[PDB]
Every structure is written in C-alpha cells, then in structure tokens.
Subunit: 52 residues, 2 copies
C-alpha cells in the first residue's frame, strides 16, 4: 500500500537523525550505542520492506 | 540531550503509523508482521531511552 511507503519514509528520517549524530563523534561507547539504534531502525526498514 | 528527545518523537510517530495500520485488520499473518515492525521500533525506543 501507500502505508508501508509512509512508515518507510518515517524510519528513513529516523536514520537521518542517527546519521547526523554520528558526525559529531564520541567514544567507541557512544558510536556502538548509536550504531545499535541504527540497526534497530534498519531492522524496522527490513520488516516493512518484506511485508510489502 | 535534546537529540534523543527528538529521535524518540520520531519513533513514536512511527508507532502511530503501525498502530493505525492495525486498526484496518488483516490475517494473523499481517498482524504478526506488523507487530514485528512494532517490536523493532520499540526496541529503538528502548535503546534511545537507555542511552539518555
């Protein structure tokens, strides 16, 4: 539908927030935590793409 | 920061899309798939809340 397309766009914006965060740097600690957040969102994108 | 607060709001909107989707119903197949999407987003909220 046009739904998954709309939820997908939502998650893509969420990745943009993460991606931006990663440009400001931090400890290896912070990087991994944010990469973990990014994985969660990407998992979201995968499910939503495999539903469609 | 005001970052996690902003990424959190993003994910919360994503849940709204899912929640809305679940009101239109479907097979047990579709429900689980969407509940799986919801889990991914909730996992994102958890990480982001445990970073803050």
């Amino acid at each position: 539908p046009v739904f998954a397309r709309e939820l997908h766009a939502q998650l893509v914006q969420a990745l943009g927030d993460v991606k931006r965060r990663l440009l400001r740097g931090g400890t290896q600690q912070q990087y991994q935590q944010w990469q973990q957040e990014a994985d969660a969102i990407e998992a979201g994108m995968n499910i939503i793409e495999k539903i469609k």
